[PDB]
């Protein structure tokens, strides 16, 4: 029986080790190895049972139950279920009233799914740069990037972090646009007690497995306010004749998920509150900003680095970053960087290929994007460290002791992050 | 067709894990690409969520995008629409694109003297297994296997060049059934 | 769905709450209501794909399989699997050479499953008083026991703490007797690095779903150091027609909790040792005592009343283990008491009515046992507290530091629990 | 398609958390007996992990005991064995203390015709459906009834009737609950 089950318990850390040497000089890491690993998603005895249920059902009956339960919880008028949080925004585009040749203005910093589904709706991305702290579309830009060709505005919730909707929406309505939202990542996300996915015209969703909200495999949801943007959508599958179906399978383990979402996110806020309020009391670290009205999903978690300090005197950014990377690795943190090329320097809208011939793209007036253009974006890139699915998974009180254990102990270490960072080759 | 068998194979991969089609140490979208591969003769396999998927696959596959042109002859009347969406239009003049067989539970178990046909591309539809939808594209053309896979938002990121992408990324646990239904269905 | 999901995590409750007020007086409980519950045994997805590998196999496989899996790992060298821990314990004892009207030195305090397994391999129980910090079978009391009758000596590993085996053993040779162990609650519990199960000549051993190591309803399991003694008991079931048989069902749920087992184990481990350490630091409890040979299974955790403080100058001690039950329930630890009169008195060994006539009994010498017999069985159950589930079931740290605050903060509060106490109504 | 209906039945009690025969709000066992009682039109079933639990509840519940005597005409090998285990001793000129009908695959869709019987004490054996060892007693008596309950340890003390020797013949749910699905898909419910 191959089974992920994890054998080892973490043991409750030594908060002596906050003064250990570090793993990357011959010290005892914090995590040991065996404590390394997380499991996700959280794979029950009810999964496999609803599995049992489901499979007895027209599998186009799984497919309808799951994306009523799920609409019902989220407040959306309207839903359409799809086999791919991708093919979800590209219905909530169409549907909202994106036709061919029109302008979406879009975040530089988001997975490329995002920016794939304007072109799939035949529409042409208007990069835009984030604002420092909240990572998401900067209101401020947007007055630059508006011409007569657009037509929407697409927010991300990247990170699980609601973007400026109050802000966003009154742009939109003022200058005619339709509001889209991207809520791949903030699945429970609210803003003013409020889901993400209800505020814009229409919005996609990820329903994949690396989700807070995990469906078993592929899958996505398109939600609409209004029963015009349903019908668009739906009348655009029959012309387009894309099969953009859910699998029951994939919506079997959503149904199921969806009872225990609640329990596993109450897990998600508390851990990723205590360890905000630990890293406030750091001099080196700083967990994410979050506005008054805003509830975090935490489906990322990422950690500002104060390279402002006088050890860091002339040590480029970057530098610091890949430091800290290998300091805390050693450690047994995993700190990867989510993403580590802005979407106008993908390959796809390098070349702007498209259908072919640059089909969406010769429509508008082509605009070539350079860095100078998203200061703030790579100032992030430069100077944050993203926590992915450590703090995605509902750890155990030992393991986020342990994670707040391991920046307190590289926050006393920060002279030889000083002096392991100006040793690191120029790129 | 045995409820039993079903649920095996989705406890096993539940048990497993291991079910986005991303993660490393996922056997189940390979084990089936194999058996495709074996029972057709083929060298390169490309699963789909969709038949969507595995037809932009074989028109891009070959560069017959939009603007282009093929031979929109043997087509039902959403593959039709399709084409129309991606920008392709019809001559008479030209071959075929690919040869698009429906699998469902009465013809898997002869699959064998189906794809024995000598042809660019075949297409499988699963879709009719009841599992979700589904379908593969088998080819000996590396360009064309190269170019499927890369339309698929990660599917070789793990110098061709891709430009619109889409999600047609098969759930393990999906690949998984329809990787029983051919087993239990002798195509060892 | 009917599932036992719990649906709200356990809040870190703060340390504060060592200065609230009694909740049973009014005040905030430790543990909220929506926190009481508990899930065991911890039926994982593992579990269930079990059963659909099982279910295609011959049930005896299965049943084979597990018996197989569980003995090597315990380390004894033959086993039956059985229906009931009760089954596996009389053949233990037959297999053991246990013949009818033969007698058995047992412990007053264990479960009546002990006794019921002696008293079916046709055999009088000889009931002992038990040391008042093991809890288990008294070696000392052992000399004014012995008879021509003795012919086995049956220890219970009792809470899941081994007994004095060095002792008991040594005892059992000099007087050329057997040791039968009951290890029903000793579940991975260890003696010098060695399972409960593996010492005496015979173990029967309790499997059911309420043990730290479950099986899939009821079971059992006997284990035999020497072969002539498994082929003894294999013998009996041939000659007696019971069918003591193990389901496979049972069975398979077994085999896959065996492969997590030293996982649940570890967790188990740590929780009940924090707990012994902090409830060191208060006057008013003390968690079990544990010989440094021994590994305790916590499969049970009884905790001892000073019920010698001030306080509690002119107050019996049932009226204080009766005020502290109350006051730990309104707090949210279900403190209960597990064997509420000792074997001796329970009715099956009043009325000794047996398989019918008095059978076993009047095979021996009467014995009216009173309870000035046993003094310190006694003492035990007027000043101790028992946590079962509560601990049995590997608890996340959160629930774990919510009890060490609950006797925390009962520990604040010594003179109402006197005044609580002084108040019980009396009970002759 | 067998092999469903198993899996889907132990998933299911399983995803309950209730496989235990003590705990409160298990309900497979009181569905068993349910279904049984309206077959057979008896007023009271037990349920045991094994045939000689039944057995011996029947006996005992007769005060059949050690050094009293029955009908051993109907006996297998086994029965035989047990009764002498017991110290029952046979006479011709006694009664039958029960009647035995082994349930098995080949004839459970047919237990109405079985069960509604005259026998005042009817023992089910079911052992062969392959769940587990398992027997179902059924009588109108209600003092064999509760006699039958108190040999069980924790039988209907769960909370006059002395018991005297005991056994742990307490039925597995899961058990119980494989078995209930068996009678409900062949005519029963």
């Given amino acids: 029986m191959k089974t992920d089950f ?19 000089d011959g010290g005892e890491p914090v995590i040991p190895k065996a404590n390394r690993k997380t499991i996700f998603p959280n794979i029950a005895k009810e999964d496999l049972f609803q599995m049992m249920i489901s499979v007895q059902k027209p599998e186009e009956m ?96 990247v990170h699980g972090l609601p973007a400026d909707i109050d802000a966003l929406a009154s742009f939109c309505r003022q200058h005619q646009l339709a509001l889209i939202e991207d809520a791949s990542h903030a699945h429970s996300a609210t803003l003013h007690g409020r889901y993400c996915g209800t505020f814009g015209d229409a919005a996609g969703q990820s329903l994949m497995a690396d989700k807070n ?20 959508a739906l009348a655009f599958l029959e012309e387009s004749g894309l099969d953009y179906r859910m699998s029951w399978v994939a919506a079997a383990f959503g149904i199921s998920q969806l009872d225990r979402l609640d329990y596993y996110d109450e897990i998600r ?106 200061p703030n974006a790579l100032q992030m890139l430069r100077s944050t460290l993203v926590l992915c699915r450590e703090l995605r998974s509902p750890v155990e009180y030992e393991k986020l002791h342990s994670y707040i254990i391991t920046f307190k102990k590289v926050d006393k270490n920060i002279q030889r992050v000083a002096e392991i960072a100006s040793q690191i080759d120029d790129v | 067709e045995q409820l039993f068998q079903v649920s095996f ?34 060298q390169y396999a490309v699963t789909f969520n969709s038949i969507s998927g595995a037809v932009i696959g074989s028109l891009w596959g070959q560069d ?76 000996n053309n590396e360009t064309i296997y190269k170019k499927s896979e890369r339309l698929k938002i990660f599917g070789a990121f793990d110098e061709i060049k891709p430009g619109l992408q889409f999600n047609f990324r098969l759930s393990p646990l999906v690949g998984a059934c329809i990787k029983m239904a051919l087993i239990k269905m002798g195509l060892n």
Avoid at chain 1, 85 to 107: F, Y
Wanted: proline letters at 6%.
């Fill in chain 1, 213 to 232: 909200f995990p469906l078993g495999g592929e899958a996505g949801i398109a939600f609409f306010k209004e029963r015009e943007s349903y019908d668009r």
């Fill in chain 1, 269 to 374: 806020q508390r851990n990723a509150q205590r360890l905000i309020d630990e890293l406030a009391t750091t001099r080196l670290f700083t967990g994410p900003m979050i506005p008054a009205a805003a509830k975090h999903s935490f489906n990322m978690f990422r950690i500002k680095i104060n390279t402002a300090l006088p050890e860091f005197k002339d040590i480029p950014e970057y530098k610091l970053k890949l430091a800290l990377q290998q300091i805390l690795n050693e450690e047994g943190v995993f700190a990867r960087e989510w993403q580590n090329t802005l979407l106008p320097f993908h390959l796809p809208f390098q070349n702007k290929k498209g259908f072919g011939k640059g089909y969406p793209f010769f429509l508008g007036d082509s605009q070539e994007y350079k860095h100078e253009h998203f």
């Fill in chain 1, 62 to 157: 799984v497919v309808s139950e799951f994306a009523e339960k799920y609409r019902q919880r989220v407040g959306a008028p309207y839903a359409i279920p799809t086999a791919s949080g991708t093919s979800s925004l590209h219905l909530a585009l169409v549907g909202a009233g994106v036709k061919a040749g029109d302008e979406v203005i879009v975040p530089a910093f988001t997975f490329i799914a995002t920016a794939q589904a304007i072109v799939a709706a035949k529409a042409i991305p208007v990069f835009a740069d984030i604002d420092p702290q909240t990572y998401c579309l900067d209101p401020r830009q947007l007055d630059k990037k508006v011409t007569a060709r657009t037509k929407a505005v697409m927010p991300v919730h």
């Fill in chain 2, 64 to 139: 017959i995008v939009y603007g282009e042109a093929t031979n929109q002859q043997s087509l039902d009347e959403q593959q039709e629409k399709l084409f129309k969406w991606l920008g392709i239009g019809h001559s008479s003049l030209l071959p075929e694109p690919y040869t698009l067989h429906a699998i469902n539970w009465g013809n898997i178990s002869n699959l064998q003297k189906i794809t024995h046909e000598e042809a660019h591309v075949t297409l499988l539809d699963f879709t009719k297994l009841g599992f979700g939808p589904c379908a593969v594209l088998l080819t």
């Fill in chain 1, 6 to 24: 994890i054998m080892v318990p973490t043991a409750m850390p030594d908060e002596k080790m906050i003064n250990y040497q570090l793993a990357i």
């Fill in chain 2, 9 to 42: 194979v989705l406890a096993r991969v539940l048990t497993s894990g291991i079910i986005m089609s991303i993660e490393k140490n996922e056997n189940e979208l390979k084990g089936l690409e194999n058996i495709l591969k074996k029972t057709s003769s083929k």
